Design an enzyme around this catalytic site. Structure first.
Site, PDB file in Angstrom:
ATOM      1  N   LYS B 641       0.864  -1.173   0.000  1.00  0.00           N
ATOM      2  CA  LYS B 641       0.000   0.000   0.000  1.00  0.00           C
ATOM      3  C   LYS B 641       0.903   1.226   0.000  1.00  0.00           C
ATOM      4  CE  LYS B 641      -1.769   2.926   1.766  1.00  0.00           C
ATOM      5  NZ  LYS B 641      -1.722   4.375   1.402  1.00  0.00           N
ATOM      6  N   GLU B 722       9.121   1.810  11.968  1.00  0.00           N
ATOM      7  CA  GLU B 722      10.036   2.946  12.097  1.00  0.00           C
ATOM      8  C   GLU B 722       9.205   4.229  12.147  1.00  0.00           C
ATOM      9  OE1 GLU B 722      13.031   3.289   8.856  1.00  0.00           O
ATOM     10  OE2 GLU B 722      13.066   5.449   9.244  1.00  0.00           O
ATOM     11  N   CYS B 756      13.589  10.941   8.387  1.00  0.00           N
ATOM     12  CA  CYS B 756      13.510  10.548   9.787  1.00  0.00           C
ATOM     13  C   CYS B 756      14.839  10.738  10.495  1.00  0.00           C
ATOM     14  CB  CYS B 756      13.049   9.082   9.918  1.00  0.00           C
ATOM     15  SG  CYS B 756      11.308   8.730   9.432  1.00  0.00           S
ATOM     16  N   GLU B 851       8.675  16.453  16.288  1.00  0.00           N
ATOM     17  CA  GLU B 851       9.283  16.288  14.969  1.00  0.00           C
ATOM     18  C   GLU B 851       8.527  17.127  13.952  1.00  0.00           C
ATOM     19  OE1 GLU B 851       8.815  12.496  12.888  1.00  0.00           O
ATOM     20  OE2 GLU B 851      10.918  12.567  12.221  1.00  0.00           O
TER      21      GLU B 851
END
Ligand SMILES: *[C]/[C]=[C]/N1=C2[C]=C([C])C([C])=[C]C2=N([C][C]([O])[C]([O])[C]([O])[C]OP([O])(=O)OP([O])(=O)O[C][C]2O[C](N3[C]=NC4=C3N=[C]N=C4[N])[C]([O])[C]2[O])C2=C1C(=O)[N]C(=O)[N]2
Ligand SMILES: *[C]/[C]=[C]/N1=C2[C]=C([C])C([C])=[C]C2=N([C][C]([O])[C]([O])[C]([O])[C]OP([O])(=O)OP([O])(=O)O[C][C]2O[C](N3[C]=NC4=C3N=[C]N=C4[N])[C]([O])[C]2[O])C2=C1C(=O)[N]C(=O)[N]2
Lengths: 956, 959
Positions: B641, B722, B756, B851
């Protein structure tokens, strides 16, 4: 001097053999060609001997052809006729009726006999009784016919007078199926009780009765049985009882001296049949698997030399004890003759023995020389007869076979006849440990009287310490809550073994805080020091072995040997995880580019919650705790309320080992109270849980919640049980299959995540296997665990008792009951139960019971057996008994389990040997005792350093 | 004599030079009667001492207190003493700290019959302010030195050659010091800017009668430097001036071709210029760089090859001295003697030649050359202590090198015959190709956009991609394309009125079809042998390699990835393929355990089942491909996906998967909305394993959903997750600010901070705060923001309008709370968020905790390493982290105390590569995901044990 005369006699014998009219090694017959091809190729030897082994268990020509293709309808007639034809060389007859004229023909040729009735392993009491009845009838019927025999003095008389004309050999373990060394005197009394009517009938008919010697595990017991029996008054004056001594054993000369002293005290001679020994490969394998001393010599010259020394000693004492020399080795035979002549012993006093069909030219020469020759005369059915044929194939193709050296390898006369004492290099019973290699802790040998006595002493002292008051321990300080749980002895439920302080949630909070505080410094303790503490724990466990066993016997109902295996496994986890951490501490260089150092390393995670089961009350708990701790984590352990006395002992050993305060905390209490609390706590980074599916699923849902203030993801290490099946193929060796299934199903009363609760049996073999299974299940004994005669003890507590009995009653409404055993009262003794023709999708064949309840399921073929085996929610252990290479390969590739076994039981997984754990609803992330397990308690990390400055980088 | 005995005549000339040298009273740099020589002897004897002494010397001028000098000394193995001693060694090789200080040294050299070329030492030009300062320094130097030289008397040995007068003033210029944003992919633009910055220096020199020499730097700018130089001096205003020079490095494999090419150009130009022939200064750097990049090694790696090539080049230039003028830069008596003879055999007069040596080097040889009547020019460095201590480190490296001719003569006591022998004798060539150790994994080389042919393919691929827009993307299940009728339009984030993809967004019924197709396929795919599954994954990597440029173009246009970022993405995707295929080939082998006789026992791995892959957009091929190939090569089937922002990229992946030959249903392509079909495959009863990389909020939701045992589910789900970071770089007080600023800029603003691993926090110790932040701000002012298609883009746009608006909102909120140090200017037409730096941000501020996934940096002050680590460790996250420091003890503290999964020392904290930097972290940065390392593939498998009793009838086969 005497050595040169032995060589001379051997030279005389070989010259005479040249004058006889062929040898069994002749490649002009099927037997010789089989052997030659086997001796040329080790794969061919294995495939050929396995094919012969299974052949009499195959009941169709197509299936013979299939087994033939896999190992290498009218090929069945051809092959089976030839192979069964080889068996007729070594078996005198299929029944006493067929063998009788063969025995009489040998008498006409100046050879006598000793008859042995071949049989499969005696696994049940029905089989033991049938074997006893066979012997009673054989002795009566052969003695009756021999009333008409003319006397043949060379075989029917010695130097003292007439000898029995009829001689039978008896295999002791065939007479009783439940020998148990821990119950030494009880087992010994029963064996004597079973042997006594046979020895008595033999004595009354003037028959010679010889007791054979089997594998080393029953050697000492056989000698005690034999000497105590033939010293009883009704037997004390009969000379014609005999015992086997195996010169390939390191303790055999000591037995010869002991039997000679006993013969003198008895005041009447008996006989010793001196052999080298039939179980050599088996004994080396068994001892190495157990980590025990090797009981056989492993240099064949040692066996030859000890045989000759034993022969010399017995001849020196021939006034009191009578040797018979069983060997086909001309060197051996010549040595015996010379030792006799040195003593002026007449020829008629000696007796030589050889296997029927073996060493024909030597056999005739001994007879021509005037000596008494007795043939070992096997009688029996096709299936045991083919097992016997394989043993002949194995011996005759051995690299050490004297006959092979003479008739196949063309060795010189000087090499064949040399003194085995010349150039003798001794061997040691201690197998050297390879450096760096992991070894499992050896289990106790309860045949050793000193170990039984220490066990009884440890049990008495444990009983005198009841009840054990168990405290909570946080930061190495003992605490109380005032809420006391009484843990009764499951074998005797009116006795309290432990009074357990059950912690509050406030104390669980204190435990969490203590572990988090300690983690701040413990995570920086060097790996070697963490590993050294774990090693010291293992040394403490080793020191306190008998006390640790006694606690598990009394609090958990674990039988002696099960409890011992638990201690060994606990020690194994300590040593294995300490060894693994010592490896994993080393940074792994990755990439390897110049100018940049990069290393892959492991870090600890934090506070670990350990929620342990009761069924392996020290081992599983210790494995979880030591793995977590050695990886640099701290631990709050919540032991099972059924086994908290066992866990208390672990905590005391941890404190004695010197783990700093708070690194490991002992938090007994209720799972729904303090277990729930530490699963949910924000400091818990890792949860190790082994137990029921329902709790495991609940724990995993709870652990997925990120608590307020929690800044990490919780990891669950979960094992949740199984519904494990053993598949029985049509060609299975039913001796091995029945024994393995019984122990897999009823060991610790089925209270193992690995236990066999399903037996899937193919249709052609169904009736034979199920009958032997039911008859064996009838024979196992159920006692309080403290009683060394217990095969099964009780289940863990009243709740399990009531639940299991509820399942049994429900299944009796749905399925044919094959067997339900009787059990003692006074504790939680659930009966061993077997249901038959259970549908594969039935609840009984799907839901885990964790009790001594077996579902036997029918399968048309291997296709259906695998479908049924794979149709549960679980994927933990599974096994097949099969002698088809292609079927074994199908099982390996298609049976969905984490621990797959071929041709042995499916429990008893050991650290390093069988890393344990599975998938589906049997768990996630738990493969204990293997090379992935410790990493579950750690985080991988990477440190990357640029080393290039001003155009320069150091070399590595 | 003999015919062709030139080698004997060269040996004779070298013997004369060495004989004369015995009669000099000059000192050798190798004398152990100085601190410099004793340092060298110990360094040549002990490599650990060599490393520590050279690093200590490197960091010394950055230390600003006596206590700190003593601390560094103790850690590596008295501040006035050590600094005075070390600064004394520097003055041996640097004529002065300023042109004013250097002037009397230059005039004294002139009185001793030697001339000079002046070079201004400096740190790296990282900003346009620094570039401008460097330009002004040269303009002032040329004007001022020419002015003073008006009063100099003529010294004919140095001020004249065989044709006439020579410039008395000679300056050397470092090209990259004049411009901070050289970008090879924008070759023509970079070349024009470099020429524009050089032109006024060349012009002023010409006007003043000054010689201007362009130095040659590292190989990555060698070709660019030659185009800059030759085009510049062929312009109308310059084409008649003889006194421009360029450096050629004979240790380069292509240098003889460049010598021939420059000679043809000199003829076409119609006016000579000069070539300063050197061997080369970057030998260690070039071999390390080429090996790290998987590129051919551009230097010879046999030192005799460099000497032999030098002599070949020297002969050629001498042969053509009518058109082009050689100057011979070398301290090697063999090299010098060969040049002398080659000149003499051509009847070239001595006054035509010129020899060059470094100031302070080879004093006995230098003096001898002058006595023999030749023109000698000393390279004359001028500059401050910090670049001056760098230069001293390069001298130490050269003089202690095992291949150094001077070391062989003055330290290793090598014979005269060995010192003077023909380097061509018995010369064995080296290959530029580094041999691959068998069985070892190697990363895919990235493209070199300095190669014109690769720029052209890139521009061709971009043109063809743009002409194919919009790309219609279908669902693919069981290798059959499907439509839903619900179309999502994905715009070009660099030009938001352009539609790049029209995506069929799947229904839940189609998600069910994907799950069913994967489950059916798993029944047979789980039995395909490991080798055949690995071969399919290898073929996928080969197809990716073939279609490299087409794959880059898709990422440039759909995701806004700049050229080099997209190229790195393709390389990482190929790397995942090859690494997981290599790993599966190892893990297929059953591991014998226990080893007892009579029982065979093996530890093996099994596949798990259908794997749901939910992939992000920021590494749109690589991360998706790594998840898919790891799952599939392990024997699982896959429903992938992709992110709605990057489904055109993933569509390309599916087409390559089909072309590689994966059977129908093994991998299924399920574009759509994450909350719809992503949720559905996460929740499905057949899904055994979920690989998700994305936000913390989604990761926590997925882990919550995955813990539910659905009706009919007979397994426990595994999540491989993650979830991002708040990554800090710590700047120690002694940090090398060239490395630190460059590393932080790229870590913070590479792909506009949408990683990231991106550095969003820079934690700077107080003593160095002002210096570092000033250079950081000036460097950030210099980077260019463009549509990703433009090769000059340092950063392009962020991914979509939601991210754009969210990021500008964070910037607006933060401007109300924190000091704004810098906000860049940005073009319109797309989602161009500005690179933004806030200063003195509290460690616990929201800006320094949440973040952002954008080009937004919080600079945080720290009193000392204690506070720096406390702040660095104070977040929810533990993904990447780094330190710039030249303190061994501080470096060790960071190693032991910084709580991150990927820790970096003295480099940037992004760009993790397969095998080299296995990537992943802890706390709220993830669980079970350490990609590209030796534990990763096992997460897609189950361990198992097979135990077989081999004992039958008392016999078991031996193994
Ligand atoms: C159950 C039944 C039985 N028994 C018997 C009887 C009879 C009459 C006879 C004759 C026999 C028998 N057995 C068997 C024996 O023991 C043996 O095995 C046989 O016999 C063979 O032997 P000989 O012949 O003597 O031959 P030789 O070859 O010389 O030898 C062989 C032997 O050796 C040994 N080894 C091997 N290898 C080795 C050894 N040792 C050391 N080391 C090494 N490496 C062995 O032993 C062989 O075999 C019997 C009997 C009984 O009862 N029991 C038993 O145990 N056995
Ligand atoms: C920027 C700056 C500059 N430049 C110069 C100038 C001058 C005046 C001079 C003198 C110099 C220079 N540089 C440097 C050079 O190049 C060199 O490096 C030096 O100089 C040294 O050399 P020589 O003396 O000749 O010595 P030798 O010893 O003979 O040699 C050395 C060399 O070699 C090489 N190598 C090493 N190793 C090796 C090699 N190769 C190959 N392989 C191997 N193994 C190297 O090169 C060394 O060094 C300079 C300049 C410029 O501009 N640029 C450059 O690059 N450089």
């Amino acid at each position: 001097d005497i050595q040169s005369q032995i060589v001379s006699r051997g030279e005389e014998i070989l010259k005479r053999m040249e004058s006889q009219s062929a040898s069994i090694f002749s490649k002009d017959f099927w037997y010789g060609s089989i052997m030659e091809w086997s001796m040329k190729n080790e794969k061919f030897k294995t495939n050929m001997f396995r094919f012969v082994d299974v052949l009499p268990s195959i009941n169709s020509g197509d299936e013979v052809a299939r087994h033939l293709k896999e190992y290498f309808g009218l090929m069945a007639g051809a092959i089976k006729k030839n192979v069964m034809g080889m068996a007729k060389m070594f078996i005198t007859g299929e029944s006493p009726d067929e063998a009788l004229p063969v025995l009489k023909k040998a008498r006409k040729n100046k050879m006598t006999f000793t008859v042995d009735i071949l049989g499969e392993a005696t696994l049940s009491e029905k089989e033991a009784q049938d074997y006893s009845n066979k012997y009673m009838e054989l002795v009566t019927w052969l003695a009756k016919d021999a009333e008409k025999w003319d006397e043949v003095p060379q075989i029917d008389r010695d130097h003292e007078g007439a000898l029995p004309k009829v001689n039978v050999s008896v295999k002791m373990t065939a007479l009783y199926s439940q020998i148990k060394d821990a119950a030494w005197d009880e087992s010994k009394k029963i064996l004597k009780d079973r042997l006594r009517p046979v020895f008595r009938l033999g004595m009354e008919k003037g028959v010679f009765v010889n007791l054979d010697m089997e594998q080393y595990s029953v050697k000492h017991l056989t000698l005690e049985v034999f000497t105590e029996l033939i010293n009883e008054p009704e037997f004390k004056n009969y000379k014609f009882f005999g015992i086997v001594i195996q010169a390939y054993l390191r303790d055999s000369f000591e037995d010869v001296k002991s039997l000679t002293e006993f013969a003198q005290k008895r005041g009447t001679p008996f006989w010793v049949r001196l052999v080298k020994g039939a179980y050599w490969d088996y004994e080396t394998i068994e001892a190495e698997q157990r980590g025990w001393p090797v009981p056989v010599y492993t240099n064949k010259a040692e066996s030859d030399a000890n045989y000759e020394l034993c022969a010399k000693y017995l001849l020196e004492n021939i006034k009191f004890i009578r040797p018979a020399f069983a060997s086909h080795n001309v060197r051996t035979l010549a040595a015996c003759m010379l030792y006799a002549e040195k003593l002026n012993i007449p020829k008629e006093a000696l007796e030589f023995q050889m296997l029927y069909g073996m060493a024909e030219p030597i056999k005739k020469t001994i007879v021509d020389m005037g000596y008494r020759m007795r043939e070992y005369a096997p009688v029996g059915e096709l299936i045991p007869g083919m097992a016997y044929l394989v043993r002949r194939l194995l011996e005759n193709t051995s690299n050490e076979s004297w006959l092979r050296g003479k008739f196949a390898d063309n060795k010189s006369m000087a090499e064949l006849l040399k003194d085995p004492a010349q150039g003798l290099t001794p061997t040691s019973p201690v197998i050297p440990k390879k450096p760096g290699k992991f070894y499992n802790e050896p289990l106790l040998d309860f045949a050793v009287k000193a170990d039984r006595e220490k066990m009884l002493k440890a049990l008495a002292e444990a009983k005198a310490s009841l009840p054990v008051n168990v405290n909570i321990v946080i930061n190495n300080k003992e605490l109380q809550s005032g809420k006391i749980f009484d843990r009764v002895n499951p074998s005797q439920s009116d006795q309290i073994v432990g009074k357990i302080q059950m912690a509050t949630t406030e104390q669980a909070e204190q435990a969490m805080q203590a572990a988090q505080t300690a983690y701040k410094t413990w995570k920086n303790v060097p790996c070697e020091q963490r590993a050294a503490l774990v090693d010291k724990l293992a040394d403490i466990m080793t020191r306190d072995r008998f006390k640790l066993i006694a606690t598990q016997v009394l609090e958990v109902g674990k039988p002696w040997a099960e409890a011992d295996g638990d201690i060994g496994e606990a020690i194994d986890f300590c040593r294995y995880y300490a060894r693994h951490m010592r490896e994993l501490q080393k940074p792994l260089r990755v990439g390897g580019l110049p100018g940049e150092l990069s290393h892959y390393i492991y870090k600890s995670r934090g506070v670990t919650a350990v929620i342990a089961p009761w069924n392996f009350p020290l081992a599983i708990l210790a494995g979880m705790v030591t793995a977590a701790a050695v990886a640099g984590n701290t631990v709050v352990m919540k032991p099972a309320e059924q086994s908290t006395v066992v866990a208390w002992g672990l905590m005391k050993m941890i404190q004695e080992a010197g783990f700093p305060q708070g690194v490991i905390n002992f938090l007994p209490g209720y799972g729904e109270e303090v277990g729930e609390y530490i699963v949910n706590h924000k400091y818990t980074t890792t949860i190790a849980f082994t137990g029921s599916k329902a709790v495991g699923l609940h724990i995993m849902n709870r652990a997925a919640v990120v608590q307020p203030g929690q800044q990490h993801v919780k990891r669950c290490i979960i094992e949740m049980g199984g519904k494990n099946a053993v598949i029985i193929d049509n060609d299975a060796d039913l001796d091995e299959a029945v024994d393995g299934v019984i122990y897999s199903a009823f060991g610790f009363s089925g209270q193992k995540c690995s236990a066999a609760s399903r037996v899937i049996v193919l249709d052609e073999v169904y009736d034979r296997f199920v009958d032997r299974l039911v008859e064996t299940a009838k024979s196992i004994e159920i006692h309080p665990a403290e009683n060394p005669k217990a095969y099964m003890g009780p289940v863990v507590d009243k709740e399990a008792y009531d639940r299991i009995l509820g399942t049994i009653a429900e299944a009796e409404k749905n399925h044919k009951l094959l067997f339900k055993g009787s059990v003692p009262g006074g504790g939680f003794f659930a009966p061993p139960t077997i249901f038959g023709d259970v549908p594969g999708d039935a609840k009984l064949a799907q839901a885990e019971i964790f009790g001594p309840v077996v579902a036997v399921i029918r399968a048309k073929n291997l296709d259906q057996a695998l479908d049924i085996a794979n149709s549960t929610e679980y994927a933990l252990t599974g096994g097949v008994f099969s002698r088809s290479p292609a079927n074994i390969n199908r099982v390996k590739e298609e049976l969905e389990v984490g621990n797959l076994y071929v041709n042995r039981g499916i429990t008893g997984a050991m650290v390093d040997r069988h890393p344990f754990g599975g998938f589906k609803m049997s768990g996630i992330g738990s493969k204990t005792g293997g090379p992935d397990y410790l990493k579950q308690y750690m985080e991988p990390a990477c440190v990357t350093e640029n080393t290039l400055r001003r155009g320069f980088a150091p070399a590595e």
